[PDB]
Design a protein around this ligand. Structure first.
Ligand SMILES: [Zn+2]
Ligand SMILES: [Zn+2]
Ligand SMILES: [Zn+2]
Ligand SMILES: [Zn+2]
Lengths: 56, 139, 159, 49, 106, 103, 93, 171, 34, 471, 49
């Protein structure tokens, strides 16, 4: 439709953030993705680690 | 050092003009344009080298660039690889008003901007480059 | 004997080969393209085709069979779909490795900053383990901060 | 009137001492279910720190 | 309820256009002296891009929108609908050229 | 014909908000009103009716030709109203089977 | 049957009991793998007796495995993260 | 076209057959399960050479199921058609949509669109045939056709022939 | 950039089903029982 | 002019400020009111213009020269967020911020055929008889959906039936009839519909509706320009490519060249390796736009129909008549002529018949009043049935009577010795081939045995209960 | 309908100076700490080191 570079940068950075947090929600140095209930999103990486993860 | 680069760039200019003539004849003879594609890798390698930009501008290779970008009389546009490589090279070099005056590439740029068979990304890049080149004239 | 008969021969895993998934392979192994954000068609059962709950992806309901393999819930393993991204994005798990690779090569000609002429570089290439090989090559090429369009004769660089 | 009512009721019901939307990082376990197994257990629970 | 005058691009309530007319286009449109059909044909309630202009003389936007010679106020970037053929001919009689703001013409 | 009509999509288009048993009863009623038109409504499924004990021994083309000849003979013995056929396609099903005419 | 019990069973040397505990007395599952790509992308239809891997376009070089359902889930979650674990039934050296 | 190939088969034996006659029983089981089968990868296996002296090796006991698994290697005669190959045939049926011929175990269907136009199908002829002025191809007639396409099924192969080029048709 | 035949508009099977082909016009014009 | 007005370095700057969603126009009006009120005062609002765009949500753009002017304009407003979220717009963006939108089509054309988004005629094709000058609504020509006393099927308004079922019809002209408050002109409804009720692009026409609309024009589908444009759109959008596809080039300097797709990037750039008599040319890969590629279909290749009435039908290419390609089908085993645009070279069919018809595999159905059979293979268009006699038949799903639902109290089998045998048990033939298998269905004295050893009809064979013994 | 008990929470006293010895791997050897709290409300306000 129309390409203000500032808007493009904002929206593409949002897409990058969503894709990154879909696979890893413990990225140090930035806030986590939160659910509507306030709990952090259980990313795929969190599924595999810990005592209760997939492997253990 | 740099006299030699000018000689090599002039040789490249002659090769590019000869390849364009050969491809135009081949299209007129019922054969596809292949010589431009054959010469494309060497032209790309030369253009990607930044330190040769000054020698390119001193030999006015943009004239041959425009000749390649000029659509052939059969109303057939050049190969998309050639257009993309030439657009990238044009972006990669500091083109000034004097160089445009020497080459007259603005006419072909406007044609690309107005045309519709051209890729929309190339259309946007042509608009951007035309605006950038009009910038120094008005201030 | 608890599994329904299948004519394919039964064998056991002997090797697990890792690697990344090429976009071509992702498109090839997919069975449907996901494009509509709405999960439900009209909130009247029958989830929207082409959405995140496409029936071709697999079945998790007892009375519904998978539309791709035709097997029941107890037998359908699930089938993948693919989503085309408008602009490429970084994989969050590979950003440090991407940075290292960017440091190891030239950003214009796409070639290594060092060649086998250097005895240390040839020694590093001689090693076998890919991880240690990459570590040594990065330790060497990190120091080299300029691409060479000429041999340190043209080495293929852009200068 | 729902703000204070719901906040107090939630904090006393769940034990998370804070706002509902800030459940993480809040001090949990402040409020507990009274132990009524026997009289001594109730008396002990009411005097616990 | 607000409508955008097609010719000058100003946006004012439709009842305001009917009762008082366009303060800028009244020299060529006579919107106040025009019936509801002509008001609709020159003022459209379907538009986009509300624009507020403070100083027509020095605002580059006003020059870009060709509203630097008009009254400051509410203006629309894009207006749905074009002037009718008869009104176009009437304006061409006056010697004034009409450039559509519908965006389809550029 | 009723059993075949309860499964035909023609009934579903005709009656989108009716049960299958309603379609079956409607087919029975239409058969009582006019067996010939109901037999015509079968279109292609009429060839699957149990007509003769050894109906499957004949080639498909020969059986189809026999059915066509029988139905043309019967409909020409009956006669077709052109005005009603124009008014309603259901009565117009019999138009192609008239002699000289065709689909 | 946690990890320490698994270590005790390893110390006893009873491999059959360990395999039975972790497969038959738990989530056992059957999958089909392509003999070429090595992925679990075979679209197997047992009733029609036809197997087919679209990516490799083969109908013959296909095997079936008995793996824990949790292993299948782990491999699918790995594939969700662009990692491709390929299972092969023969060694290569 | 016929070939000699070295093939291998995996044979599973139930423990109830663990007797002195195990080897011969495996041999007849292999013969019954291979002779006459049709595999799309290889085609048709017609015979197994040296069928009574095939080595079976040592069977491996499958852990947890008791049954032994045997790896049997053998040499067999295999026939498989190829795209663009011209072979002899015998017509088996004549139909308006085309005629069906037989090339050994394979049955080949040739459509009218791959038949020369002068060979107009004659249904009045006894038996009905695709005939021309000098050519008449009916049931039982020798025909030379070129296989154009092959269709792979579960355990069947479907081939399409043509007689529209030179040196084809009736022979 | 700038350029009716019903053959290109719809599939020939659909056209034959809907009776919109040259055989159809010949049959309709012809003075003979179908 | 228009080109000369492009911005310069000395032109006033443009700032963008984030605001609360939905309050952008309110902030614009507040800014204008503040500027007017402070105009002519000692400290007027030193700005030039301010605006916003609907697409760029949450942003308000002000043209000024100083940041203090922006702060003064934003001072006293509540929609501005706490932080000074202001940024300097790049001069190149100045043209883009005010460029128009929705310029794809000039206008809705009267006489065009369109689809309806919602309403009682949701999805019905409609001709645009009239376009209202407002552009929000338009009068359309539709096929009425009436019952005359969940929607009735579309049908031309019949005045006689309407009067019989409702004698309150009105008349206003000749050929223009108003019934029940709805205006029907010569059997076609004419009703105004809003622009938000229409789809003016990607319109899919059907020859049935086209004939029903054009019959009153004394010629079948006389108008075919918009239809031809729709055909071009359908042909262009339906093309999808995969690596290894043999394609031909229509335009460019490389026109009339063959090549194989090597890799696919996005959906508009395709890397192709060309094939030619010169070896040095065959070793080059060229990226070519998809708009100038046509698929090459060679005779004798497995191809699957992408879209149309024959969707999911496969076969082998037989005749290549340019745009239209002919292939012998696999299921119907008959030649079908479909455009090359609807075919993909798929070497394997593996067609799934689920979610189609009423019957699945291994279903005991009644062929007719006399013949009862079982399903051996299902098709997208028909079914294959093995009957109790031992023969095979092909019939459409409609022709089949119904599934023979039998309770265990009805599906009972007794062997030769008299011992009851139930469903799924294994029995062996007493004589003959002496085969064995698992019972699939029991009907009268007929048993449907299936065995994995038998390949014919997927191992299904009918054998009488009197000739088998329990295993 | 459920009986909840508030468990008393133990905290360090405010308005008192606490002097601590930091560990060796640090430029700091000793720290003087104080946390302030207004008398009215007894709420923590600020900390100083
Ligand atoms: Zn499935
Ligand atoms: Zn370089
Ligand atoms: Zn005005
Ligand atoms: Zn594979």
């Amino acid at each position: 439709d129309g390409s203000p570079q500032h808007i493009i940068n904002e929206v593409e950075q949002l897409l990058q953030f969503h894709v990154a947090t879909y696979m890893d929600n413990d990225i140090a140095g930035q806030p986590q993705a939160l659910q509507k209930s306030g709990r952090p999103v259980k990313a795929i990486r969190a599924r595999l680690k810990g005592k209760e993860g997939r492997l253990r | 050092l740099e006299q030699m680069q000018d000689e090599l760039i002039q040789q490249l200019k002659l090769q590019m003009e000869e390849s364009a003539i050969r491809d135009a004849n081949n299209i007129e003879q019922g054969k596809p344009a292949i010589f431009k594609l054959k010469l494309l890798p060497k032209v790309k390698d030369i253009l990607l080298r930044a330190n040769l930009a000054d020698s390119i501008l001193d030999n006015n290779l943009l004239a041959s660039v425009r000749l390649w970008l000029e659509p052939l009389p059969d109303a057939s546009l050049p190969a998309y690889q050639i257009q993309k490589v030439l657009f990238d090279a044009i972006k990669s070099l500091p083109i000034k008003t004097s160089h445009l005056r020497e080459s007259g590439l603005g006419k072909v740029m406007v044609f690309y901007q107005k045309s519709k068979r051209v890729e929309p990304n190339l259309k946007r890049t042509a608009e951007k480059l035309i605006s950038d080149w009009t910038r120094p004239i008005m201030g | 004997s608890q599994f329904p008969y299948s004519s394919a021969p039964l064998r056991s895993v002997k090797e697990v080969q890792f690697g990344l998934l090429s976009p071509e392979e992702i498109r090839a192994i997919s069975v449907v393209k996901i494009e509509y954000p709405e999960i439900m068609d009209e909130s009247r059962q029958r989830p929207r085709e082409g959405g995140l709950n496409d029936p071709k992806l697999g079945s998790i309901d007892r009375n519904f069979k998978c539309q791709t393999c035709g097997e029941g819930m107890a037998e359908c393993p699930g089938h993948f779909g693919h989503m085309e991204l408008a602009k490429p994005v970084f994989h969050i798990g590979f950003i440090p490795k991407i940075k290292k690779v960017c440091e190891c090569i030239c950003m214009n000609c796409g070639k290594l900053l060092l060649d086998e002429t250097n005895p240390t570089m040839a020694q590093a290439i001689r090693i076998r383990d890919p991880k240690k090989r990459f570590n040594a090559v990065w330790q060497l090429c990190k120091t080299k901060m300029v691409c060479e369009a000429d041999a340190p004769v043209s080495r293929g660089g852009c200068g | 009137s729902t703000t204070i009512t719901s906040g107090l009721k939630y904090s006393l019901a769940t034990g998370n001492w804070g706002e509902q939307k800030k459940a993480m990082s809040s001090r949990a376990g402040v409020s507990q279910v009274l132990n009524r197994y026997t009289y001594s257990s109730t008396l002990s629970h009411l005097r616990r720190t | 309820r607000e409508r955008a005058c097609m010719l000058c691009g100003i946006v004012l309530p439709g009842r305001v256009f009917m009762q008082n007319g366009c303060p800028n286009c009244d020299s060529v449109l006579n919107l106040r002296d025009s019936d509801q059909a002509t008001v609709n044909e020159c003022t459209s309630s379907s538009f986009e891009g509300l624009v507020a202009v403070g100083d027509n003389e020095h605002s580059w936007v006003a020059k870009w929108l060709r509203v630097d010679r008009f009254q400051p106020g509410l203006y629309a970037v894009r207006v749905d609908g074009r002037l009718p053929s008869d009104i176009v001919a009437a304006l061409e009689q006056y010697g004034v050229y009409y450039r559509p703001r519908d965006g389809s013409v550029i | 014909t009723a059993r075949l009509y309860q499964h035909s999509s023609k009934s579903s288009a005709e009656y989108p908000n009716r049960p299958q048993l309603a379609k079956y009863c409607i087919g029975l009623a239409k058969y009582i009103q006019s067996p010939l038109l109901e037999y015509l409504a079968l279109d292609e499924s009429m060839y699957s009716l149990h007509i003769h004990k050894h109906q499957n021994l004949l080639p498909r083309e020969k059986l189809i030709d026999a059915v066509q000849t029988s139905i043309v003979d019967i409909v020409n013995l009956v006669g077709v109203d052109i005005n009603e056929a124009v008014r309603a396609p259901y009565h117009a099903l019999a138009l192609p089977y008239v002699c000289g005419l065709g689909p | 049957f946690g990890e320490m019990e698994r270590d005790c069973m390893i110390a006893h040397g009873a491999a059959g009991f360990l395999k039975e505990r972790l497969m038959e007395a738990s989530d056992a599952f059957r999958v089909h793998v392509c003999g070429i790509c090595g992925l679990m992308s075979v679209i197997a239809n047992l009733k029609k007796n036809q197997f087919e891997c679209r990516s490799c376009k083969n109908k013959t070089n296909i095997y079936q495995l008995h793996i824990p359902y949790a292993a299948k889930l782990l491999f699918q979650e790995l594939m969700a993260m662009n990692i491709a674990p390929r299972l092969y039934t023969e060694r290569s050296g | 076209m016929f070939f000699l190939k070295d093939l291998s088969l995996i044979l599973t034996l139930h423990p109830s057959y663990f007797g002195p006659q195990m080897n011969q029983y495996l041999r007849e089981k292999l013969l019954t399960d291979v002779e006459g089968t049709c595999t799309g990868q290889f085609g048709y296996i017609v015979t197994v050479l040296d069928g009574m002296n095939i080595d079976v090796g040592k069977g491996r006991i499958i852990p947890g199921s008791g049954s032994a698994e045997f790896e049997v290697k053998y040499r067999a005669v295999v026939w498989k058609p190829f795209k663009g190959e011209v072979v002899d045939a015998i017509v088996s049926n004549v139909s308006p949509i085309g005629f069906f011929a037989d090339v050994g175990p394979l049955n080949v269907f040739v459509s009218t669109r791959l038949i020369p136009d002068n060979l107009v199908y004659n249904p009045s002829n006894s038996p009905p045939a695709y005939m021309s002025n000098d050519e008449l191809i009916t049931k039982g007639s020798k025909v030379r056709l070129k296989v154009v396409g092959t269709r792979t099924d579960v355990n069947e192969i479907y081939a399409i022939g043509s007689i529209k080029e030179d040196f084809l048709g009736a022979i | 950039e700038q350029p009716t035949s019903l053959a290109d508009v719809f599939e020939p099977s659909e056209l034959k089903e809907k009776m919109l082909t040259d055989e159809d016009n010949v049959i309709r014009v012809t003075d003979l029982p179908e | 002019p228009q080109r000369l007005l492009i911005p310069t370095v000395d032109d006033p700057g443009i700032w963008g400020v984030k605001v609360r969603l939905g309050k952008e126009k309110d902030v614009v009006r507040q800014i204008l009111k503040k500027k007017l009120a402070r105009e002519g005062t000692k400290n007027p609002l030193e700005i030039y213009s301010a605006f916003q765009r609907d697409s760029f949500k949450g942003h308000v753009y002000i043209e000024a020269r100083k940041a203090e002017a922006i702060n003064d304009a934003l001072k006293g407003n509540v929609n501005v967020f706490s932080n000074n979220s202001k940024f300097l717009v790049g001069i190149v963006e100045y043209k883009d911020l005010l460029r128009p939108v929705k310029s794809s089509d000039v206008k809705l054309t009267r006489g065009s055929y369109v689809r309806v988004k919602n309403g009682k005629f949701k999805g019905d094709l409609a001709q645009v008889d009239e376009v209202l000058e407002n552009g929000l609504e338009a009068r359309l020509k539709l096929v009425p959906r009436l019952d005359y006393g969940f929607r009735p099927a579309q049908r031309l308004f019949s005045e006689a039936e309407a009067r019989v079922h409702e004698p309150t019809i009105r008349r206003d002209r000749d050929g223009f009839v108003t019934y029940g408050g709805e205006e029907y002109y010569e059997g076609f409804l004419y009703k105004t519909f809003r622009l938000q009720n229409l789809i003016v692009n990607s319109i899919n026409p059907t020859l049935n509706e086209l004939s029903l609309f054009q019959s009153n024009e004394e010629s079948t589908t006389i108008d075919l320009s918009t239809i031809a444009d729709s055909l071009k759109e359908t042909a262009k959008n339906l093309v999808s490519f995969q690596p290894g596809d043999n394609v031909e080039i229509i335009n460019g300097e490389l026109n009339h060249l063959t090549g194989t797709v090597s890799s696919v990037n996005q959906s508009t750039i395709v890397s192709v390796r060309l094939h030619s008599d010169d070896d040095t040319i065959n070793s080059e890969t060229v990226e070519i736009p998809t708009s100038d590629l046509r698929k090459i279909f060679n005779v004798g290749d497995h191809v699957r129909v992408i879209h149309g009435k024959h969707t999911d039908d496969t076969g082998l290419i037989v005749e290549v008549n340019g745009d239209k390609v002919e292939f012998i089908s696999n299921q119907t085993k008959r030649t079908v002529i479909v455009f090359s645009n609807y075919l993909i070279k798929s070497t394997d069919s593996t067609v799934s018949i689920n979610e189609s018809g009423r019957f699945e595999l291994h279903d005991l159905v009644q062929v007719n009043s006399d013949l009862v059979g079982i399903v051996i293979r299902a098709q997208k268009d028909s079914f294959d049935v093995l009957c109790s006699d031992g023969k095979l038949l092909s019939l459409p799903p409609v022709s089949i009577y119904s599934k023979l639902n039998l309770n265990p109290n009805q599906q009972i089998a007794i062997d030769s010795n008299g011992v009851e045998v139930k469903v799924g048990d294994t029995v062996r033939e007493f004589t003959g081939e002496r085969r064995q298998g698992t019972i699939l269905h029991v009907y009268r004295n007929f048993l449907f045995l299936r065995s994995r050893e038998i390949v014919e009809n997927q191992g299904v064979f009918v054998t009488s209960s009197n000739r088998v013994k329990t295993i | 309908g459920s009986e909840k008990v508030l468990i008393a929470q133990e905290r360090s006293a405010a308005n008192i100076v606490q002097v601590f010895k930091k560990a060796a791997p640090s430029p700091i050897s000793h720290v003087a700490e104080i946390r302030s709290a207004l008398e009215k409300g007894s709420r923590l306000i600020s900390t100083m080191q």
